[PDB]
Amino acid sequence: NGAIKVGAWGGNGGSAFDMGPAYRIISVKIFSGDVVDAVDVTFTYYGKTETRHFGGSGGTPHEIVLQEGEYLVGMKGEFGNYHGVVVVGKLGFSTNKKSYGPFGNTGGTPFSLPIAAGKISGFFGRGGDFIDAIGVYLEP
Amino acid sequence: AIKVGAWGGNGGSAFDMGPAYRIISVKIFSGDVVDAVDVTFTYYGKTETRHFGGSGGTPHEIVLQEGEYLVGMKGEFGNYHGVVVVGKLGFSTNKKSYGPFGNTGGTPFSLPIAAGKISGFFGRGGDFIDAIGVYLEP
Numbered sequence: 001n002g003a004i005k006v007g008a009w010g011g012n013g014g015s016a017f018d019m020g021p022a023y024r025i026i027s028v029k030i031f032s033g034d035v036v037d038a039v040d041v042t043f044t045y046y047g048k049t050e051t052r053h054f055g056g057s058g059g060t061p062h063e064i065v066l067q068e069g070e071y072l073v074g075m076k077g078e079f080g081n082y083h084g085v086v087v088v089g090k091l092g093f094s095t096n097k098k099s100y101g102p103f104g105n106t107g108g109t110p111f112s113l114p115i116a117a118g119k120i121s122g123f124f125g126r127g128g129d130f131i132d133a134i135g136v137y138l139e140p
Numbered sequence: 141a142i143k144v145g146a147w148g149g150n151g152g153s154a155f156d157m158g159p160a161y162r163i164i165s166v167k168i169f170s171g172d173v174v175d176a177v178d179v180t181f182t183y184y185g186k187t188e189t190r191h192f193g194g195s196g197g198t199p200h201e202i203v204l205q206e207g208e209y210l211v212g213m214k215g216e217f218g219n220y221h222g223v224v225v226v227g228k229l230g231f232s233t234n235k236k237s238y239g240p241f242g243n244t245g246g247t248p249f250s251l252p253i254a255a256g257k258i259s260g261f262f263g264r265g266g267d268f269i270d271a272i273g274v275y276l277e278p
């Protein structure tokens with residue numbers, strides 16, 4: 001509904017997910033090991049603060065807590081075959097303050113989304129055992 | 141405004157066409173490398189053309205038909221005899237995909253647009269197209 005969605009980068013495995021845009025991403029938690037297992041996002045939508053759980057439940061958590069006036073302004077990673085499956089094998093974000101990651105240890109086809117104007121407001125993609133694919137909502 | 145990119149190097153001079161009402165056509169000049177781009181578009185009742193990059197290469201026109209929009213951009217950038225330039229460049233509309241054009245591989249980048257469209261360009265250019273980036277509209 002006026003949305004701008006770029007991606008998803010990755011494979012066609014797993015099931016579709018789409019959190020829609022948020023008023024405020026509070027934190028992003030990337031679960032990884034060899035590969036990107038999953039992503040938890042906690043956010044406020046119309047007053048309510050929710051957490052959605054994407055991908056699978058393996059891997060080690062890596063939390064990005066957004067400070068007041070800190071926004072996600074970049075996403076990059078790599079997707080490739082992980083013993084049969086095209087999943088996001090490395091995943092990273094940058095904010096207007098600091099860069100995070102990349103998380104994951106499997107190299108593959110790089111992708112990169114530098115945002116010169118605007119910010120990330122939400123996520124979509126595909127998840128199964130791991131993060132098959134990830135994509136992003138943009139707003140000014 | 142939503143500006144994404146630019147992908148490529150830091151050589152050349154910065155260009156910025158701003159967002160347009162409607163992309164009419166994109167002409168991609170390439171050889172070994174992406175030399176340049178001509179973008180024809182409408183702007184507040186005026187129709188305009190901008191050249192970004194140099195004069196080398198063979199052109200490939202993407203002419204946009206009725207209710208056809210740019211919903212994807214992809215290519216590769218790399219060091220080409222001393223300068224980091226777009227070595228391959230491609231686009232997709234809602235109806236079909238184009239190219240990619242250029243014959244020099246490098247670091248890939250891809251911008252699929254699930255919702256929204258490309259409404260304009262910015263980046264860097266010299267005698268080749270050093271870098272390209274994109275304005276996004278809903």
Ligand SMILES: OC[C@H]1O[C@H](O[C@@H]2[C@H](O)[C@@H](O)O[C@H](CO)[C@H]2O)[C@@H](O)[C@@H](O)[C@@H]1O
Nearest residue numbers: 032033034035036037057058059060130
């Ligand atoms: O990120 C994927 C996964 O990586 C690591 O586990 C490996 C695999 O689960 C599988 O191939 O079994 C291996 C046998 O020893 C194991 O290394 C862990 O980091 C895990 O938490 C993660 O889910």
Ligand SMILES: OC[C@H]1O[C@H](O[C@@H]2[C@H](O)[C@@H](O)O[C@H](CO)[C@H]2O)[C@@H](O)[C@@H](O)[C@@H]1O
Nearest residue numbers: 151152153222223265266267268269270
């Ligand atoms: O667009 C690429 C590049 O063009 C110009 O660079 C010059 C050429 O690469 C060539 O003639 O060799 C010169 C010296 O090695 C070089 O300056 C410039 O516009 C440059 O900024 C740009 O990157």
Ligand SMILES: OC[C@H]1O[C@H](O)[C@@H](O)[C@@H](O)[C@@H]1O
Nearest residue numbers: 032033034060102103104105
């Ligand atoms: O450097 C952070 C690092 O931590 C662990 O070793 C794993 O979770 C990796 O996926 C991650 O890359």
Ligand SMILES: OC[C@H]1O[C@H](O)[C@@H](O)[C@@H](O)[C@@H]1O
Nearest residue numbers: 013014085127128129130132
């Ligand atoms: O997450 C990767 C992988 O996980 C499971 O094995 C299935 O859901 C696959 O469809 C999916 O591609």
Ligand SMILES: OC[C@H]1O[C@H](O)[C@@H](O)[C@@H](O)[C@@H]1O
Nearest residue numbers: 170171172173174175196197
């Ligand atoms: O792309 C760089 C270069 O490639 C080829 O040599 C030709 O097609 C030229 O026109 C072009 O300038």
Ligand SMILES: OC[C@H]1O[C@H](O)[C@@H](O)[C@@H](O)[C@@H]1O
Nearest residue numbers: 170171172198240241242243
């Ligand atoms: O390889 C893509 C593209 O690269 C060059 O610029 C030309 O030779 C084109 O005719 C060709 O289609």
Ligand SMILES: [Zn+2]
Nearest residue numbers: 040052053054
């Ligand atoms: Zn979770």
Ligand SMILES: [Zn+2]
Nearest residue numbers: 081082083084
């Ligand atoms: Zn294997």
Ligand SMILES: [Zn+2]
Nearest residue numbers: 177178190191
């Ligand atoms: Zn021209």
